[PDB]
Every structure is written in C-alpha cells, then in structure tokens.
Amino acid sequence: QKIILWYRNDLRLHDHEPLDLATSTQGQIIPLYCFDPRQFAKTSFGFPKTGGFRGKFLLESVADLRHNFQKIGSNLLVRIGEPERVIFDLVKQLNIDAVYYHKEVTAEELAVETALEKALTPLGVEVKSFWGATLYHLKELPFPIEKLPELFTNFRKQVEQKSVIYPPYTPPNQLPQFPDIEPGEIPTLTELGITPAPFDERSVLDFAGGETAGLSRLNDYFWRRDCLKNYKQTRNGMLGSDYSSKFSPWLANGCLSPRWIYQQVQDYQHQRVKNDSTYWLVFELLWRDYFRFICLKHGPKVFYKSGLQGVKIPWGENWEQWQIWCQGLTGFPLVDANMRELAATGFMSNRGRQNVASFLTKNLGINWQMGAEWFESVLIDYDVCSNWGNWNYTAGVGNDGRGFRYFNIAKQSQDYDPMGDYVKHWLPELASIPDGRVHSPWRLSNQEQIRFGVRLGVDYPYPMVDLQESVEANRRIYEKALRMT
Numbered sequence: 001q002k003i004i005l006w007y008r009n010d011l012r013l014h015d016h017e018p019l020d021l022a023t024s025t026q027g028q029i030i031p032l033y034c035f036d037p038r039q040f041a042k043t044s045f046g047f048p049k050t051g052g053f054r055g056k057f058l059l060e061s062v063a064d065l066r067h068n069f070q071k072i073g074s075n076l077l078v079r080i081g082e083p084e085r086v087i088f089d090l091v092k093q094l095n096i097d098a099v100y101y102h103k104e105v106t107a108e109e110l111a112v113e114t115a116l117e118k119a120l121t122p123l124g125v126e127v128k129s130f131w132g133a134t135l136y137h138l139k140e141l142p143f144p145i146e147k148l149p150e151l152f153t154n155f156r157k158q159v160e161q162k163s164v165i166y167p168p169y170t171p172p173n174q175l176p177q178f179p180d181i182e183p184g185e186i187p188t189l190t191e192l193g194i195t196p197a198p199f200d201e202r203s204v205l206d207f208a209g210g211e212t213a214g215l216s217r218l219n220d221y222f223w224r225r226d227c228l229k230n231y232k233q234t235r236n237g238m239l240g241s242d243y244s245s246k247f248s249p250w251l252a253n254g255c256l257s258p259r260w261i262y263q264q265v266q267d268y269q270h271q272r273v274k275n276d277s278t279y280w281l282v283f284e285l286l287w288r289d290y291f292r293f294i295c296l297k298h299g300p301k302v303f304y305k306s307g308l309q310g311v312k313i314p315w316g317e318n319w320e321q322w323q324i325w326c327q328g329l330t331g332f333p334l335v336d337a338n339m340r341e342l343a344a345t346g347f348m349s350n351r352g353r354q355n356v357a358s359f360l361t362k363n364l365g366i367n368w369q370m371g372a373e374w375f376e377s378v379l380i381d382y383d384v385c386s387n388w389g390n391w392n393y394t395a396g397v398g399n400d401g402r403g404f405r406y407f408n409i410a411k412q413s414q415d416y417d418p419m420g421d422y423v424k425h426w427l428p429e430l431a432s433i434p435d436g437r438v439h440s441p442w443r444l445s446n447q448e449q450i451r452f453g454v455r456l457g458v459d460y461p462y463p464m465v466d467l468q469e470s471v472e473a474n475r476r477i478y479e480k481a482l483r484m485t
C-alpha cells in the first residue's frame, strides 16, 4: 500500500518497470533519491570519486527527476546519507510496505543492496529489484549469465538471432499525492564537497542533466538535424556536437533508457532511412550491454589489476609520468589535446579515449587502473561497466581475442585529424604550426619554432617517449606476462 521507489542510476520516468509496477497497484508511491556520501569521497589512488563535471550533471538530473514527478502530482524525496540507513529510517517513519529499485552489477552498488536487504528484512518490508539498464534484458538472453560468450561478436550474433528487444514502458501521467513531509534540499556542489568546474566554451555540448534534456538531445540529433543517417561516417570525429549522439551522460545515470533510444532508431529507420549508420548506433549500444553483462558474469575481477583475464603484469606507477599524461604534457598533440579536453569539459570522444588509454598502457606502461580511476573521477558520462570494461580491453586483460594491440599515435593523428583542426583547438600554443606538421612539433627547426611562436621544451614539451621503442618494450613485458599465465 505504501511503496518507496528508490532511485540511483535510473533517473527517469520513461521505461521504468519499478514505477510501472508501483503505479499499477494504486498504493501510495514515494520516490526517493539519496546522495550517498561514499560517492563523494576518493578513489583508491586519491582522486575525487565524483568530479565537478559529473557532479553538476547529477545535480541537474536529480532536479529534473523531482520536477517531472511534480508535474504528475507527486514529488521526489531527497536525503543525504547511506541508503541502507536512510531507507531504514524512512521505512519506520512512514510505515512503508515495500521498496522497489533497479538492480546493479558491481561491488560497491551490490554492497548497498545487500546492506539494505539486511536492514529491512527484520521489519518484514518487501524489497523488490528490477533489471532495467540494458537494451536486451537479462531474462531475454538466449543463455544463462554463466554462459555469456567471452567474445562480443558471439554475444552479438546470438542475441540478435535469438533474443527480442521490447518496447519501453510508458511513463504514468498521474501519481498519488506525496506525503506531508519535508521534501529535502537538493545539495549544491559546495555542500557535497565537489569543486565546481568553470565552463569551457569548447565543450562539445553545454551538457544539461535530466531526462528532459536527454530526450531533447535525441530530438535534436535524430529528428531536427537528421544526423543519425550519417552516424557511422562521423563517429570518429572529435570536433563539434554532432559527430556522435552525445547520449552517454544521460545513459550513464539513466536519464535515457537504451530501449527508448532503440525505439526511436526503429522509428527513424521506418520514417527516414535504414542503413549502416542507423544500425551502428545500436551496435554501440550493444557494446554497452555487453560490458554490463561481462561485469555481471565476472564480478569484481574487472577491478583487479590482473583484470578479467587474470594476467599479472608488472605495471608501472610512476606518479610524475602519470601526472604528465593527466595534464596532457606528453609532447604528442593527439594525446595532449584529448587529455586537456577531458580536464576542461568532462568529455572525450571515443576515438580520443581509445588513443589516450592506449598511450598510457602501451607507451608509458603505466597501471591501467590509474587511468580508469582518473576517467571515473572526471568523466561526465562515467559508467562503471563501460569504463572499467573498456580499460580492461585496452590494457590487454579483457579476453578480447586480439592479444597485444596498440594504437599507432602517428597514424591515428593523420587518419582522424589530418589538418590538425582538433589538436589546434585544444593546444593554442601549437595553432600557428602549418596544418599537419602540427602533429610532430619536435621536427621543427629552431628558426621554425620562433616563426611559429612555440619553442620545444618551453612552450610545448618534447615527446616523453619514442613511440616505436616504448611500444616494443611494453610488448615484450606483455608477452612474458602472458607466457607466465
């Protein structure tokens, strides 16, 4: 009769089975979001657990969720504290009969679920969890999770052949009255202890948190601007808002459901064009599904330094070299521009993420966990499974069927930034080097350095490694570690 709808990374009213089931019972529904202080502490290497870019986006997303509940006659209860304690107190305060929530798959989130169930079972309060973050739901997979294929291509073949994607649930348009209790202040970044990040106008979007803004972004990218038809051709871009969907920060905290996006793709294919690009956006959502299922199957191994594959590697952890990567002072413009874009905006293109993660692990040989945690801190779109899964894959410990692979920074620079437009946008100190030559500033003569206004070792660093020598050294280490496994 009285149900708390506990929200975490599912900040929406569309495609929300817990909300759908609760509204069908006609009991009193009490939506709740808890700001969990453990989310605003530190990662193991000491970075803010939630940096300022994602913090601002989260606060905007929680405010929008509250507003959207208010529009249909309810509200969102907001509290600060550990949910296993906050919900226990609220259950006693309001004589709650049931708590509904969405299932997570990684250790920290599972510990909260376990502690909550332990706290509530003495009270006889029903706890009901729902699977809701993926395109294909766990129950539609053609295999148990223990038999999830260890290669993505095999996962994709089997689900596309044998499984069905279902339409999103439609949100309710009316809810019972909110209880006569203090609604709760949504805290500021200051109150959470998070440093606010000034806006950099070069941000690919002025990202705004919330289901409302995420739905509008899809409306812009699919319908108003008709970009989806070109997605496969543009998705390796690094400048501009519309080289890709930019749906990721809304998918990561659940402002958008992948099943809602998929329904819109089906509509676009029916109404405009069906081609390799409309499929490829779904293809990338499938990668998102796969990393989440991989984390479900393998549990905490995705966080172990030896990774999903269990390969013990003598990774380096030199702080000075790591800091140079973090600050984009490596001397390689493609890497440096991407790291500085991340530090200024909280976002990095997929093409950039592949390159900087390869540089850290294949050129510097530095522990991939240090990169994964930096991404966790700074990314506006941090998704634990996609981030930690992708870092395992990049580092060669993901069972990806490829062995030692690496990104040739020189070739990637020519292929994806041939005129230097991207690196000059983020590295103004290099912007007067003639196009293309900008990717190898170490080749400039003393006279050219003066003419183009940039002196190596002063205005822009010399390369911190030789690309070829460093990859060869780390390849040998990887090969030996693989042999010893």
Ligand SMILES: Cc1cc2nc3c(=O)[nH]c(=O)nc-3n(C[C@H](O)[C@H](O)[C@H](O)COP(=O)(O)OP(=O)(O)OC[C@H]3O[C@@H](n4cnc5c(N)ncnc54)[C@H](O)[C@@H]3O)c2cc1C
Pocket: 235, 244, 245, 246, 247, 248, 249, 251, 252, 281, 284, 285, 287, 288, 291, 348, 349, 350, 351, 353, 354, 357, 375, 379, 381, 382, 383, 384, 386, 387, 388, 390, 391, 394
């Ligand atoms: C080292 C590394 C770390 C990453 N960390 C994250 C992370 O924390 N969160 C995150 O959502 N993605 C992460 N990615 C995946 C990918 O780079 C981002 O999803 C993408 O850059 C977001 O831009 P978009 O929304 O415009 O993507 P698009 O190309 O428009 O759209 C694809 C959508 O599908 C998903 N997606 C696309 N590519 C991938 C991929 N390779 N792996 C998983 N999901 C994908 C995202 O939800 C994305 O919004 C990481 C990739 C690498 C190599």
Ligand SMILES: Nc1nc(=O)c2c([nH]1)NC[C@@H]1CN(c3ccc(C(=O)N[C@@H](CCC(=O)O)C(=O)O)cc3)CN21
Pocket: 106, 107, 108, 109, 300, 303, 304, 305, 306, 376, 384
């Ligand atoms: N949103 C989110 N959820 C998480 O669960 C999560 C993150 N983010 N970011 C990184 C941390 C780190 N995570 C970890 C890290 C270690 C173990 C673990 O069990 N470690 C082994 C040691 C393994 C080894 O040393 O090789 C242990 O027994 O402590 C579990 C989860 C969980 N992580």
